[PDB]
């Protein structure tokens, strides 16, 4: 349900940030030869992408956002 | 004169701070794990991962940095 | 249950300000304990101070609330 | 100095006495055979916390906090 959808939520922001930076730089800025990394995404990012989801890494994120753009509400609105 | 090194460390902290705090309470499916548990896993891919997370400039939230946010945020929210 | 709670909230923000890790180090508490610290000891001492009608209050957690108002309140 | 802690434990132990070394240990909770073990490791540590928490955490210290505390509150 949510521990799985929200894990994949992270598999996705993770893959996306590789993408952004460069599959290349995000791979020599962080070990793992071209061939190994990428087809590593296949099997090992999904795994510790659940992990983050397990730590609620979301609520903190989301809460750090809820509160953020909630205090940005005494600004938006008063 | 650290740029990435440090954060791969700041991040890596709060992680094994949670893979023990909530850790092998649920962490074998949380990451679908070998015969059974392995923190020998963690020293394998958590440090690399923390790097990635750092490289990806992924999140932050120091645990007592949050609290302060929250408090300030509550102070600014009444 | 008393303003012991109020006090707890204070001490924790101070610890947070100064830094949970620097503060454990500066105080006795080693990273091993920091939780016990925050979950038995802080609350318990907070009662004592409440009972002791001690008081010491969050002025510093003010300067922050407002000092985050300085930067955020302007762009 | 950091016998600032001593002056604290001192003032704490005074308020305690001045109020009741039991009217107090129940006001907070805890009894006689442990009530004595309380005076010594606990009060001092708390005094030390109080004395640490009583260091300046100066301006620039207050700035890096106020900065990133707010860097997340946006």
How would you describe this structure to a colleague?
4 copies of one chain form a homotetramer. Chain A is mainly α. In chain A, 64% of the residues lie in helices and 0% in strands. In chain A, helix 1 packs across helix 3. Chain A is elongated. The termini of chain A are far apart. At the A-B interface, helix 1, helix 3, helix 4 and helix 5 of A face helix 2, helix 3 and helix 4 of B. Chain D: One of its GO terms (biological process) is viral latency. Chain D: GO terms for molecular function: DNA binding. Chain D: Homotetramer. Interacts with cIII; this interaction is essential to stabilize cII that would otherwise be quickly degraded by host protease FtsH. Chain D: Belongs to the lambda phage cII protein family.
Topology:
Four copies of one chain form a homotetramer.
Chain A: H1 2-21, H2 25-28, H3 47-54, H4 57-66, H5 68-71, H6 73-76
Helix pairs in contact in A: 1-3
What CATH calls the topology of chain A is: 434 Repressor (Amino-terminal Domain)
Radius of gyration of chain A: 16 Å
Shape of chain A: elongated
By DSSP (H or I, 4+ residues per run), the number of helices of chain A equals 6
In percent, how much strand structure appears in the residues of chain A? under 5%
Organism (chain B): Escherichia phage lambda (Bacteriophage lambda)
GO molecular function, one term (chain B): DNA binding
Subunit structure (chain B): Homotetramer. Interacts with cIII; this interaction is essential to stabilize cII that would otherwise be quickly degraded by host protease FtsH.
DNA-binding region (chain B): 24-43
